[PDB]
Task: structure prediction
Amino acid sequence: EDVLAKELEDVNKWGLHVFRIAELSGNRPLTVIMHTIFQERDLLKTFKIPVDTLITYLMTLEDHYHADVAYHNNIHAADVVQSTHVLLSTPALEAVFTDLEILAAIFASAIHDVDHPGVSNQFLINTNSELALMYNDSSVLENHHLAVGFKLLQEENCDIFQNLTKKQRQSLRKMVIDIVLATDMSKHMNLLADLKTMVETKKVTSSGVLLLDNYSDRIQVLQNMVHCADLSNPTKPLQLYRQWTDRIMEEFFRQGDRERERGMEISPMCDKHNASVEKSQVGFIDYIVHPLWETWADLVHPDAQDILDTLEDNREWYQSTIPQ
Amino acid sequence: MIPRFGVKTEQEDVLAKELEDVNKWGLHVFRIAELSGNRPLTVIMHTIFQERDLLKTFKIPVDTLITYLMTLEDHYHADVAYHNNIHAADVVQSTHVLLSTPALEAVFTDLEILAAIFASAIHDVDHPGVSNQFLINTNSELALMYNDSSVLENHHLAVGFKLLQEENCDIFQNLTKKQRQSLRKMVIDIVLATDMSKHMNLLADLKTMVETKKVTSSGVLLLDNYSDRIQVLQNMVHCADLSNPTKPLQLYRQWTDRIMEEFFRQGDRERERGMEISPMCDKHNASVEKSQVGFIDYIVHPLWETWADLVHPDAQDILDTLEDNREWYQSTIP
Amino acid sequence: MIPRFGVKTEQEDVLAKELEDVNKWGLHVFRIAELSGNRPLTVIMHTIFQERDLLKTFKIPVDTLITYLMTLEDHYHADVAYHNNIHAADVVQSTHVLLSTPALEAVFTDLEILAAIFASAIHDVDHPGVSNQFLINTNSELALMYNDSSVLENHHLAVGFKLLQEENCDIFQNLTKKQRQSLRKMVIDIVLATDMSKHMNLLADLKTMVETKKVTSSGVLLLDNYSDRIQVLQNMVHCADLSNPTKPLQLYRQWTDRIMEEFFRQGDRERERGMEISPMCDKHNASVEKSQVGFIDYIVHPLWETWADLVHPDAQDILDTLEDNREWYQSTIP
Amino acid sequence: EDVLAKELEDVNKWGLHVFRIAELSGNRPLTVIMHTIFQERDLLKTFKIPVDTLITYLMTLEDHYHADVAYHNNIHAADVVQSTHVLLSTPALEAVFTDLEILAAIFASAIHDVDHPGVSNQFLINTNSELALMYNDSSVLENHHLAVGFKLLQEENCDIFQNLTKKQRQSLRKMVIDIVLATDMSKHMNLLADLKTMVETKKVTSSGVLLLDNYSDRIQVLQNMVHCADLSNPTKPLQLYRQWTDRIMEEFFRQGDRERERGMEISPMCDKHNASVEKSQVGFIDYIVHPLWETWADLVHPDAQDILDTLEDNREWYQSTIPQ
Ligand SMILES: COc1ccc(-c2ccc3c(c2)COC3=O)n2nc(C3(C(=O)OCC(C)C)CC3)nc12
Ligand SMILES: COc1ccc(-c2ccc3c(c2)COC3=O)n2nc(C3(C(=O)OCC(C)C)CC3)nc12
Ligand SMILES: COc1ccc(-c2ccc3c(c2)COC3=O)n2nc(C3(C(=O)OCC(C)C)CC3)nc12
Ligand SMILES: COc1ccc(-c2ccc3c(c2)COC3=O)n2nc(C3(C(=O)OCC(C)C)CC3)nc12
Ligand SMILES: [Mg+2]
Ligand SMILES: [Mg+2]
Ligand SMILES: [Mg+2]
Ligand SMILES: [Mg+2]
Ligand SMILES: [Zn+2]
Ligand SMILES: [Zn+2]
Ligand SMILES: [Zn+2]
Ligand SMILES: [Zn+2]
Result:
């Protein structure tokens, strides 16, 4: 408990020992990290959130992440929350976002993978699952994460937004939806193209912070921020990154074992018999993660330079462990 | 031509004579609704399935088709003045006429044709007669389920597909897996395009296609990729949905009465609830005639002019009727 | 027009004068439905809540009550002839009168009163105008969700509670968890008891209670456990649901006209689908009068005679009206 | 492969090594045991069930049992299926049930706990969970297990009943609902009362098997049969029984840990700090399992004598471990 309170002092740092916090909290990393961030940002007072209500909702939300899913679980959620909390604190964005925008980004991060079954949208579509039927094969999981995250507010003593005005609730809800729907990898190339356009036309205020003077630009930055947090594993200290790689490959390989036993075509990087884990990480960095983080780094220059350096060091480490 | 080789009733002969106009713009769809005992969608869909030989092509058991159509029609609301089974029947039949345009002869496969007419049939099913924004503002279960995003269009799809699971309702039971996967994708792409939030981008793409328009030796449109094929089918069904002002005036006037009854009821619900009354939903501060002229000038004529260019000159009489009706409504403005 | 300003409109004053009968058997509920612009459930629930001081007792904000009532009423189907918002308003008002019977003076708590009146309000919400068996035989999604077991009664409850989550609809927001759990249990026990499959066991239990009937110091029923208290509330609401033949004949006949319209519509759907036509649903082979005498002799009279024994002699005039109406229907049979 | 085939030779015996089968099948005990039983009973030929359709439905059903739940998982499902299969085979029921009734009992067994979250109905009710709202706090999970088991027939190549006639489908669906809704412990006392009445008025055919000449009696026996299978753990060899007790207590204590952290009242026998594992097992046997199994044993006398003897031996063993 002393040891937990001590790990939690690193909540404003890139590279928080999130797996240690998961162990020390009795598998409550999302609850303890969200509560710590809400206290640090004074969101309970700003939004008149009863503390019992916040903890009941966080326990409820965390309980709806699957303990049997190796990657898309409550530890990933806690990690995305905490990574978004650090990116919101970047000097280039100081005083740019309102308290409601900050609440939206953090809540969006907390709920963004809730009730993830550990299989892809394409798996749910191919099996004619009830989820794919309900969501017309379109951002199936991302739509579901949102509906679950909002629906859990109706459980006993779970409505953390009970003291927001209707106008606050409507704005918070629209921003959360816009953010989580943007975590669908189908939207990655269009999000990145828009971030690059903003970098090429970047304006700063006289205080040297980003100028975002319309909803479109404000929500683009929040979408790309939470997308960066979601795609942040290769930017973390290598000891953390390697644990995340082991977890995503366990999850992918289990999907491929389900595809194989069902006579389905095995999804890319899901065949444990035809795998190159290290080459796949170098490819993920070269094609997805480095392009995104290099553009983010230009938007907030020079705030993210150490994150980009770590990304490049970690890319060289995976390259160096690709077998013969 | 309905063959006759036996004596039949009054009502039967009149219904049969009206159904002979199923391949024409300006079908007497309200008369068919009355004559069929409020089964316009069932009788019009069945007639079009026969006209296109879809039962034979897709091995649809006739009992299954009739059961599915009556089930689908039963999930349109009898108390909704505009977004009901008569509108569904009208969009199906309008789409059926647009598929037959000379510029599209032999362009679409039987499965694409099936997708366009099935999408038309289901595109407003279980419509409550209020807008997405009303469902969003009340924190409706539907708005929660669909994250405030194309709420009703998502729902229409889910319902239209779910109704295939009722007893003897699976009209696709004899499709192969590959046909079902392709049909499903096309139907989703078409119905989600009927959200008016999508209209400006749809119209932009149709405009781009007109400018880069390629024709075959036959003088018929060249559509050689899914993106172009689905864009035409999306715009085709959206034209069918927005076709009321292009119809013979006696039809157009009834469609206007119905949409304004539905809008005014929504405004009466907003008023009683202390909500902001939605645009053209306030019966105390409405200009039905000005709104139709605005609807034509800013939505319907821009779409239909662009459609008429894609299929030039096939849609000239439709555009002429639209321009005449616009002048009629204009002339009734105080 | 002269704007209104804190005085009733003439139509509102006429509605107020009709609502002076809210404590009487035989309220002009159809006239209330017309005068209120098809808001009988909202206006009658609001009147009864004010009369029983339930807003102060349960700290229910008036805007929340009105919002929830309009929402609930809006989820009754305007196209369904019998199982609609007028039927809900009638069961509410009938329950309200039964709760006031001298034999029950000071017996029930405010929470039990709230449970009986709320249960009555929600007991048929979102009724599609067809029977459980119709929904089971068509493999409807509702029958799938509820395992063919009290399908509509389960749905009415789920919808009545789910609508509390719409914007400014949670009328129970100020109740304690203990109050909410008790209210919820009582409401569920009552509405599930409106399934006619439960009628014989409910009546068997009411008879047992009449036989072992104990009064108190003041000649009022003694109910000293949950089992007997809920039994009486279940039978009370079931009598209210089955009250139409106990009303003045001008009201009873409007109810018979509506149930037969609803039943015949179900039979027309069964006929067109090739299904067996349900009992009393064939408009070509029905005896409305024989069916009402049967309904009374086998279902309504045995229930009301037993209720009348429980509350002796408070229900004598209700039982006399029932017997007079039974004689009237019998005398109209060829 | 060869070891699995060897263990599955025991599929017609009480006391099958179901945990070993779970390990050898790669956590597919439900799929392999159902497939074996369908093949043994010739149900694929009788009901024209395509073998690929059967295996796809079984793996889909098995996948909807939660891998993180210690007791109410695919191993429990496999166990209840196999236990029902042995009970249907009893001499007293030879040629009594039709192939459709046998199919109904084995299908109901397979689906009877699907999508169990590892918490009780009361926990779902107290939290205002979406399931409890849908089901009006009434047989919440039992209704849900049925809805799920039927809905999964609609996934791609899952409709194992596609070649039944309409009348066969209507009959099967009614029987399956009747059987699963009877696994609700709220129905146990009325079910046992009716089984006792049947034993008191027991008739046998001219061939000496149970005489059941109406639906009410036939469904009564199938309901009690699957209820016996569900409550069969204390009747198994003690090494199997103790493994089941370890699992149900892990599941209960996890529920109590969730109640405690939420500030809820801890459910009976869910408090790991105030537990009587051994006294609870003896109470369970004395008040529920022994009255049920003694009555079943009367109904099929003497077929269940060894099962009843094992139950009484295990009851004495646990009694011997209860502190003073
Ligand atoms: C620690 O390494 C990882 C962490 C996280 C993810 C990841 C997987 C799926 C999603 C996301 C991230 C965000 O939204 C998703 O749907 N991946 N994904 C890969 C590879 C992959 O296949 O990436 C391509 C995908 C994301 C299109 C194998 C290389 N590695 C990693
Ligand atoms: C015969 O006249 C009409 C027919 C149909 C429609 C219509 C209404 C709503 C939707 C659609 C069409 C398609 O998707 C929808 O959500 N309207 N709508 C208008 C006006 C209107 O407000 O237009 C709104 C635009 C954005 C649809 C008053 C002029 N008139 C008519
Ligand atoms: C004014 O006359 C009526 C009013 C109300 C009802 C009624 C119908 C269905 C339900 C209930 C009441 C309560 O729960 C139900 O499911 N019936 N039902 C009949 C007949 C009938 O079939 O009654 C037998 C039913 C109740 C099983 C045709 C004679 N008449 C009337
Ligand atoms: C290996 O021993 C066990 C196995 C299974 C079960 C069990 C638990 C819950 C349900 C069922 C069985 C069937 O339907 C249910 O809702 N129990 N339950 C107990 C105790 C218990 O609490 O029993 C009372 C329950 C059955 C209400 C601790 C003593 N032990 C065992
Ligand atoms: Mg995700
Ligand atoms: Mg629409
Ligand atoms: Mg009812
Ligand atoms: Mg169970
Ligand atoms: Zn994620
Ligand atoms: Zn439409
Ligand atoms: Zn009723
Ligand atoms: Zn079980």
Remarks:
- Chain C touches chain D at residues 144-149, 154, 157-158, 161-162, 181, 184-185, 188, 192 (CB under 8 Å).
- Chain C has one domain: 10-331.
